């Protein structure tokens, strides 16, 4: 990793083994969750391609997912060399060279070269480019696996609606649902599968209400019996 | 966050995984309580909008509440931009400009822009303003996930006066209650089920008597009960 | 807090969240009790009123006790305003105004104004003053949540003298009685409230005995607990 | 090892007991698995020959494997002298003396002399060359002590295809055979030792399909994907 | 504690809360065991008398022993004053004042003086001296609560000698006596208070017997040792 | 320890308790095994007598063995006394003394005197001198404890050669002998204690073969000798 110094330009220092073990633990529990993505992003601030490779190539768990991630990195790298030709030709002496896909993923690039890119003026952001391919591969393996199924969740007869709203949002996190999708899903799932005594209020309120308006509706409707009707 | 004592070089570093893990664990044990708010503020000392966004996105529980919190932030950010003529927007050479509400929320602003405003003299306090908006949304979430009604808090025969006081002041922490209303409540709600002589002591004391005197008041069991000495 | 306490140049730095958490967990894992108070002073050496308020606001629990502390520091502010009234009207241009109780307790006065008082002649250390007010409140909680008098202690029939002395000192610390009175209590009262079997041994040391003479006496007194205690 | 941390230039410092204890724990429970190599690489970032010797001598387990590793290192060290034959004694004072093979292994060299090579301009990478010799030895012992081998692996009759690929991949990446062999095993061998019902689907798909296309197929083989995962 | 980077320049740093918690918890678990002494030695690294007093003041457990430790440091502080004649009144112009025993134990000194002594010509190591006195106070607790009379010790009938040696040496460590007297005790009392079968071996060896020679002696005392080498 | 290389020469640096715990974790699990010597050597880099005594005192259990180490040091100190004639009377401030054997072991001496001896011309490297005495004591406990009998290791009729050599090498490492004797045993005893059906194969293989050639030899009769238990 390479970070700002109070005494001058940026300094590279070795990765901690304890943070590396802590990384392996979040990978083990949270590989199939969006939770690992900001933790990885925060960890990877000031990371070289070598550091990013060390983080990936340390892991021994989930080898099918790791191979799919490596295949994804190769696939993104192949696209980069299609997108960018070798414009600058055979390398100009003295000058910084322009990364190819394999250079970005650190297979044809050494650590001191990467530190040179980090410390160059203007900054050359090879690590910042590479981590997005890694994040994309993590999203892709989750998408291929698909553990979460939105339409399955429903309420028993006297269950609180407010917790079901939380369960619905919890179940919907990784799917990439827009505001329009949330409006549609409110109509095609949430209003339909709600507590039966809450339904009349929700039908009056309609699927274009705010989440706060949904949350602050249906007061005390949950728990034993049908209660005395407000409408 | 910005780090160090602000002398010579204005260094800044990324948010730690340890801090993010500690925050997630705090959310497990202490939730969104007013007692968490100064601790969250302590985490947020010299924080950028990017660091603040990283903390919000890390949390995996309370997903509906997170969506309400983000849309509350978007409402506050919109409200800010109609509180004066709008600040100048994003620029390709990266001239200093000023932050509008979305820049404060971190949704139109780069990390380098955020550091730029923060290290400007006089500084524009974007992280502090955004931290306050996050706290304002967290204040909404705790209130939604609170028991209802101050009028259910009343003195009874069952428990010491202390427990009613503990409940009463705990209840109003996120509410920002009136002092005159609190005096009226202290006079009314907290003398309700007292027996005549005990009610007379509370009446004689009034609402501006010390809690130390109120705890020590009302010796022995109610009615013809035992008076706390074996003679 | 202030960097290098009262001995430095009066430069500020933000509170540690880990240190703030450690304060909350001292309260959780020991409750408001004598051993909290020196630990509180140790973490609070250079603390500002804002830092001290931040510590009070994040406790959560012990709300009735915290109210007695709030009333105690409200009374200290009231006493300060009563015995040190500020000059009437807003101050004349270009000078330092006198401090009110609210200014000292960090609610009406800015940190830069407080540093203004710390760079005054005489210097007024608002954090140091406010800590004494807080310590009086903590001592009041400690006395209140001690439900016994020092005069009502008696050594058990099956209690060794060493565990009685430890229990006596813990009881004595809760009581806020005068310093030469506390020395008189250790010299006279501790032997007087020692058990019948130990008491003849202690009386035979004579009235001018040192702590080591008392503490190395009474061997075999305190039944199976004494036998468990011996090394 | 050598470390900068906040320093502008590399500082030689002793290997931690924490580094050594983690190394022993990794060796004892994971040596014959390719998890040892990246963690060894991380724990030996800027390691000296003396640090590497300290690590090698701190192992007490697996002495036949350590001897096979030592013999493999001994050949490469013996080879280095044939390839790069050192004239002993710099011709004119003002130079570092050249590393011979036993100097790289640490046996004929002393630590300040080793640091002189490693802090030279450009660096003379004696630790990295020694690590390459160690890695060739590690790659020898992992195949030797493997309990299972690739051709013996077969898909269970009720086993998910996605888990079978993962289980096959764990064995495959502990195989030390060349990329042509690896590519034949992943593209051809894996399909053959798949379950009969699954294998017919793979035959219909054909061998030119990518891993994404292969993982897309094989629906209705094994239990649900969300079972037995950490969610 | 002090944090140092240069010769003759010292920077005051706060005590770690992790260190304060560790110090309290080991004392809670183990009481004032000998095992406190390495933990105290580790946790008081670069400690000042102010830090050491804060560490003592922090403790709330074991008050009778803690008061005895406080008497013991005061006895040591008096012992220092009674054996050094110092200066009456103010020190002569431009000289550092000479530390008294109460200055060493931080009763009459303050933090600025303490760093002054540590950077004096020659240096006076007031914290390290005070640490020995604190250790004498910790040691005192074992002698008072144990009956350390050296001729009343015995070896058990089936006891394999080594535990008796551990007990005898522990008795010597607890007891206050001359090194020459303790040397005489190894030739006399150790042989004398041994069990008959072991004593029979010891008489043949004679009083020049040593710990290495002792280790392979007494191997059948109370029966065979069998496959144990930890007894 | 005095482990810093840049800035002040004799600048203080604290020992970490977590680093000491990592030493304890190895020492408890492995006891007095040959790997203690490199672990202790890495730990005791740049150590003072004060640091060395902390390291010794945190080793738990085995007091008779620990006293044998202490006595081995005491004998070195007795021998040292003849070699170097040093004497002192009563001790005062204002002079940093001459090093006696007890001072070198740190019993009668403190950090600043020890620093003064390293700042003397010629230096006296008191911790290094003491450390060699400690290493002899540690080696003696290791030789006393670790050996389990090389002469009882021999290949049974259904034992794999590969299992046998690994166990023989572990046992051979445990033996207290010289490397020269161990090389002779490796040549002779290892082949002689082989089973006669494998011994004929070893004769055919000759001195020429790699350990891997020997390891892959001696098929059938016994089990596979490398497929282990599933852990």
XYZ file of C-alpha atoms in Angstrom, chain A residues 1 4 7 13 16 29 44 48 72 84 96 103 105 131 146 154 161-162 192 230:
20
model
C 0.000 0.000 0.000
C 0.534 10.355 1.937
C 7.402 14.494 5.626
C 4.837 0.321 3.173
C -0.263 -5.883 7.832
C -18.817 -14.599 5.534
C -8.070 -0.807 -1.055
C -1.153 -1.002 -5.834
C -13.676 -11.610 -15.510
C -6.901 1.294 -26.468
C 6.042 6.993 -18.203
C -0.233 -4.272 -16.922
C -4.026 -6.426 -13.625
C -10.284 -2.427 -8.331
C -28.541 -15.576 -7.291
C -44.966 -12.958 2.548
C -46.344 -4.730 8.182
C -43.449 -2.373 9.160
C -50.501 -7.505 -2.165
C -60.390 3.453 10.934
